[PDB]
Curated annotation (Swiss-Prot), chain A:
Function (record text): Essential component of the nuclear pore complex. The N-terminal is probably involved in nucleocytoplasmic transport. The C-terminal is involved in protein-protein interaction probably via coiled-coil formation, promotes its association with centrosomes and may function in anchorage of p62 to the pore complex. Plays a role in mitotic cell cycle progression by regulating centrosome segregation, centriole maturation and spindle orientation. It might be involved in protein recruitment to the centrosome after nuclear breakdown.
Species of the source: Homo sapiens (Human)
Protein family per UniProt: Belongs to the nucleoporin NSP1/NUP62 family.
Assembly and oligomerization: Component of the p62 complex, a complex at least composed of NUP62, NUP54, and NUP58. Interacts with NUP88. Interacts with NUTF2. Interacts with HIKESHI. Interacts with OSBPL8. Interacts with CAPG. Interacts with SAS6 and TUBG1 at the centrosome. Interacts with MCM3AP isoform GANP. (Microbial infection) Interacts with Epstein-barr virus BGLF4; this interaction allows BGLF4 nuclear entry.
Annotated compartments: Nucleus, Nuclear pore complex; Cytoplasm, Cytoskeleton, Spindle pole; Nucleus envelope; Cytoplasm, Cytoskeleton, Microtubule organizing center, Centrosome
Written domain comment of the UniProt record: Contains FG repeats.
The protein's name in its UniProt record: Nuclear pore glycoprotein p62
Residue span relative to the full protein: 367 to 418 of 522
From Swiss-Prot, chain B:
Function field: Component of the nuclear pore complex, a complex required for the trafficking across the nuclear membrane.
Illness the protein is tied to: Dystonia 37, early-onset, with striatal lesions: A form of dystonia, a disorder defined by the presence of sustained involuntary muscle contraction, often leading to abnormal postures. DYT37 is an autosomal recessive form characterized by the onset of progressive dystonia, dysphagia, and choreoathetosis in the first months or years of life. Affected individuals show delayed motor development and may have impaired intellectual development.
Self-association and partners: Component of the p62 complex, a complex composed of NUP62, NUP54, and the isoform p58 and isoform p45 of NUP58. Interacts with NUTF2.
Location of the protein in the cell: Nucleus, Nuclear pore complex; Nucleus membrane
Entry PTM: O-glycosylated.
Covered range of the whole protein: 291 to 363 of 507
Family stated for the protein in its record: Belongs to the NUP54 family.
The protein's name in its UniProt record: Nucleoporin p54
Phenotype upon changing residue 68 to S: In DYT37; uncertain significance
Record comment regarding domains: Contains FG repeats.
Protein source organism: Homo sapiens (Human)
Length: 52, 73
């Protein structure tokens, strides 16, 4: 009777870890959008001190 | 099929009409088949298994618990 619960515990646990992984690598990547979109707001600091 | 395979044709020296009836009487046939049990040491038996069983349950439960801690951390 307990063993069964154990089962849908295992279940739903590794689908939680499918979860987190994912959200994990997600946060890297939203994170990388933040390193790129930054270097290059400037190198947009050329294009704008040139105009100047 | 294999269930069907062993449960009939009778076991250990257990009477065939009783063995039948444990089959009808069986509360929960997939999870379960009738298994002959033999006086006190047999209950001893069962208990030894139960304990055997107990430790492994406890442990697997610990494994789920560790994975959950890792996710929460």
């Amino acid at each position: 009777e307990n063993g069964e619960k154990i089962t849908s515990l295992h279940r739903e646990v590794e689908k939680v870890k499918l979860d987190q992984k994912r959200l994990d690598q997600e946060l890297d990547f939203i994170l990388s959008q933040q390193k790129e979109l930054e270097d290059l707001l400037s190198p947009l600091e050329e294009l704008v001190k040139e105009q100047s | 099929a294999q269930i069907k395979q062993l449960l009939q044709n009778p076991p250990a020296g257990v009477d065939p009409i009783i063995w039948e009836q444990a089959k009808v009487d069986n509360p929960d046939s997939e999870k379960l088949i009738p298994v002959p049990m033999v006086g006190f040491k047999e209950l001893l038996r069962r208990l030894k298994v139960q304990d055997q069983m107990t430790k492994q349950h406890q442990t697997r439960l610990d494994i789920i618990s560790e994975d959950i801690s890792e996710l929460q951390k």
